[PDB]
Amino acid sequence: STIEEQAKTFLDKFNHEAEDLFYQSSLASWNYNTNITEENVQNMNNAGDKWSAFLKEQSTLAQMYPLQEIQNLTVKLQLQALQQNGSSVLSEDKSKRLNTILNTMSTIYSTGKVCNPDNPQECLLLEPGLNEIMANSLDYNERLWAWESWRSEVGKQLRPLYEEYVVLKNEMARANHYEDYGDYWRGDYEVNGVDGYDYSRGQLIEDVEHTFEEIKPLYEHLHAYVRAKLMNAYPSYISPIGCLPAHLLGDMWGRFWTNLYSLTVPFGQKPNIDVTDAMVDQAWDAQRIFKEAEKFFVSVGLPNMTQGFWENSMLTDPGNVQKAVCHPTAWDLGKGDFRILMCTKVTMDDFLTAHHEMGHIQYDMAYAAQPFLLRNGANEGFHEAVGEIMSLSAATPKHLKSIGLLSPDFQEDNETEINFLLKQALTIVGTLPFTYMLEKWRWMVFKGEIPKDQWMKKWWEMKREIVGVVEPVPHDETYCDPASLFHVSNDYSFIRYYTRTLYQFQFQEALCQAAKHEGPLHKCDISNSTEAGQKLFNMLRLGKSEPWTLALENVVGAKNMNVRPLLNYFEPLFTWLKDQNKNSFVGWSTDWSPYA
Amino acid sequence: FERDISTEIYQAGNKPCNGVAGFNCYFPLRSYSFRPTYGVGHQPYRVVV
Ligand SMILES: *[C@@H]1O[C@H](CO)[C@@H](O[C@@H]2O[C@H](CO)[C@@H](O)[C@H](O)[C@H]2NC(C)=O)[C@H](O)[C@H]1NC(C)=O
Numbered sequence: 190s191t192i193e194e195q196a197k198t199f200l201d202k203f204n205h206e207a208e209d210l211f212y213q214s215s216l217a218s219w220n221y222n223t224n225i226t227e228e229n230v231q232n233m234n235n236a237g238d239k240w241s242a243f244l245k246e247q248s249t250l251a252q253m254y255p256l257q258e259i260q261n262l263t264v265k266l267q268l269q270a271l272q273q274n275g276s277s278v279l280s281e282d283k284s285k286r287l288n289t290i291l292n293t294m295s296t297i298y299s300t301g302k303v304c305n306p307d308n309p310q311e312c313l314l315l316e317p318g319l320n321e322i323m324a325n326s327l328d329y330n331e332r333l334w335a336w337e338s339w340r341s342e343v344g345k346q347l348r349p350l351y352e353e354y355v356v357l358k359n360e361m362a363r364a365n366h367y368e369d370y371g372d373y374w375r376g377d378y379e380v381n382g383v384d385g386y387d388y389s390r391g392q393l394i395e396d397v398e399h400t401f402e403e404i405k406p407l408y409e410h411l412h413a414y415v416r417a418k419l420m421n422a423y424p425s426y427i428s429p430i431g432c433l434p435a436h437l438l439g440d441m442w443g444r445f446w447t448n449l450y451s452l453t454v455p456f457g458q459k460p461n462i463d464v465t466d467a468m469v470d471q472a473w474d475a476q477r478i479f480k481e482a483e484k485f486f487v488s489v490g491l492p493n494m495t496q497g498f499w500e501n502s503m504l505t506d507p508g509n510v511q512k513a514v515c516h517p518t519a520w521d522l523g524k525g526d527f528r529i530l531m532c533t534k535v536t537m538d539d540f541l542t543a544h545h546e547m548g549h550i551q552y553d554m555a556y557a558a559q560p561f562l563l564r565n566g567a568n569e570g571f572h573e574a575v576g577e578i579m580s581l582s583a584a585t586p587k588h589l590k591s592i593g594l595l596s597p598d599f600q601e602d603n604e605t606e607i608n609f610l611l612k613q614a615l616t617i618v619g620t621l622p623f624t625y626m627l628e629k630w631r632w633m634v635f636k637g638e639i640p641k642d643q644w645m646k647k648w649w650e651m652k653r654e655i656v657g658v659v660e661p662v663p664h665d666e667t668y669c670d671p672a673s674l675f676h677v678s679n680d681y682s683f684i685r686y687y688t689r690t691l692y693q694f695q696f697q698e699a700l701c702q703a704a705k706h707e708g709p710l711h712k713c714d715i716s717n718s719t720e721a722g723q724k725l726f727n728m729l730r731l732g733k734s735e736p737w738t739l740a741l742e743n744v745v746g747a748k749n750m751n752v753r754p755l756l757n758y759f760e761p762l763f764t765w766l767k768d769q770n771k772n773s774f775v776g777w778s779t780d781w782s783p784y785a
Numbered sequence: 786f787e788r789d790i791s792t793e794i795y796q797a798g799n800k801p802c803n804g805v806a807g808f809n810c811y812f813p814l815r816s817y818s819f820r821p822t823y824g825v826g827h828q829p830y831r832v833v834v
Pocket residue numbers: 488587588591714716717
């Protein structure tokens with residue numbers, strides 16, 4: 190009886206019990222999500238507690254297996270994900286204080302309340318007031334006041350908690366044999382034991398730095414264009430070569446540039462392609478939208494889908510008394526059960542969103558035969574890097590005309606392509622430097638290269654260099670600006686979005702080459718391309734049994750991050766951005782600030 | 786053409802099981818635990834040969 194045989198015998202029963210237990214936990218959570226009631230809270234809490242206890246007991250039982258004596262590169266992978274000692278190495282007091290820290294951070298972030306001046310009665314939360322003001326309101330005074338209030342009343346409430354969280358995460362990383370908590374996050378991509386395909390955590394920093402440097406020339410052109418367009422709206426607020434103010438970035442943190450499309454449009458006389466009025470005219474409903482999506486999906490060779498999806502999952506807002514969350518969720522309960530939740534309304538936004546979720550569950554069902562511990566993507570970017578790309582390809586005018594939502598009389602003119610590319614760049618291109626510098630700052634804070642007294646003192650140079658953003662009011666170390674984000678308070682890695690953005694465009698080159706599509710990359714449709722469907726399914730079906738490098742080789746034939754598809758997508762756009770920026774300074778200066 | 790009804794626990798290790806559930810000694814019988822929401826390929830099937 191070898192050690193590998195014992196590990197396999199344990200893992201068979203572990204997977205068999207864990208599948209059913211996670212199915213029970215998932216159904217308990219789904220019942221609460223689709224029906225918010227007092228009994229469902231208790232049911233979900235009990236299911237979660239039972240699942241956590243079972244996982245902890247199984248991990249303690251499996252701690253006796255040393256990882257050195259398992260061959261086959263498959264059983265050891267499950268043991269690595271099962272052991273996961275994490276914070277349990279430390280004492281129980283340090284675990285409960287971590288739980289308290291996370292709970293208080295989440296509570297403080299959720300209870301963010303801002304009260305208008307001269308009236309301590311009409312206070313507002315993040316939504317729907319502050320969010321609407323940050324997304325649509327253009328007044329300098331109100332935006333500055335809201336930004337200052339949100340970064341003041343929340344930063345100090347978490348700054349000592351942030352310090353203690355950083356210190357204890359560093360202690361946990363040291364106890365788990367890690368250089369820092371940044372490496373703890375980066376450990377997802379690490380690949381070992383495979384000849385010619387090994388990966389290291391440290392190499393990821395260099396890999397992302399190189400691709401950021403190669404992306405850079407595409408970013409400052411867009412930034413200069415945005416600044417030039419904003420110069421016509423705020424003539425006495427932006428320096429000609431200075432950085433843009435923090436609260437004039439289109440929202441509260443400046444992560445997305447898409448909120449300024451109504452102002453930074455080069456051609457305001459050409460409306461975009463919106464066929465929501467069309468589907469209103471033909472009395473399109475949720476069922477018709479889902480049938481059209483299924484017709485699109487069957488065209489690439491994907492198999493049929495079980496009737497239980499239609500019977501069990503709800504796809505229409507109930508309204509009335511029954512209150513349920515409307516967040517788009519794809520539940521993979523396991524054991525052949527797949528559900529999707531939407532509050533479908535008559536809008537093309539829901540039509541585009543359903544393309545994420547239906548392909549998302551298509552990916553989920555691909556790895557059904559895999560062990561329960563390996564029913565995930567090879568990395569955190571493979572999960573729906575394809576699910577997003579089908580949604581992007583569904584917006585092509587060709588398929589819109591084919592399905593009858595757009596009349597054939599829509600003659601294609603190059604005016605629309607430039608506007609569409611600029612709108613896409615306001616969401617994808619702009620966010621890349623901001624995400625990169627935020628991830629780098631968090632990595633440096635976790636590693637400790639940034640001193641305690643200069644977390645913000647070092648914070649504002651990257652804003653002046655990587656993203657070209659300058660604060661409107663100077664702040665000392667008392668404030669904690671980064672703490673006002675969703676991910677930092679919930680302890681989530683922020684590089685996932687950047688990696689997914691990098692991965693989505695890489696697949697498009699292979700998908701369009703297989704489909705033999707000709708023309709611009711953003712007008713590429715994967716319809717009637719069943720060969721590309723088989724090619725993508727061959728990668729979707731591997732699940733977690735194979736390293737992410739092998740899956741990346743199976744689509745494009747590489748072992749490192751590729752940015753050439755990113756330039757290929759915006760290749761016509763970059764040349765035009767070379768034209769209107771010839772009379773304006775491309776870039777920004779780090780010496781001037783709006784507050785002087 | 787054989788039927789097994791014995792419920793003796795399988796021994797996956799060198800030490801004797803001693804009739805107690807634990808390391809390398811698991812109960813050989815497991816329950817289907819069927820639910821109406823199972824998939825097409827996981828639903829119960831009545832097989833006669
Ligand atoms: C994919 O192929 C299908 C059928 O092979 C196309 O559906 C037909 O499209 C033509 C014009 O493109 C229409 O006149 C027909 O009414 C459609 N339905 C049929 C023939 O049943 C579909 O347009 C193709 N999609 C793309 C993007 O080329």
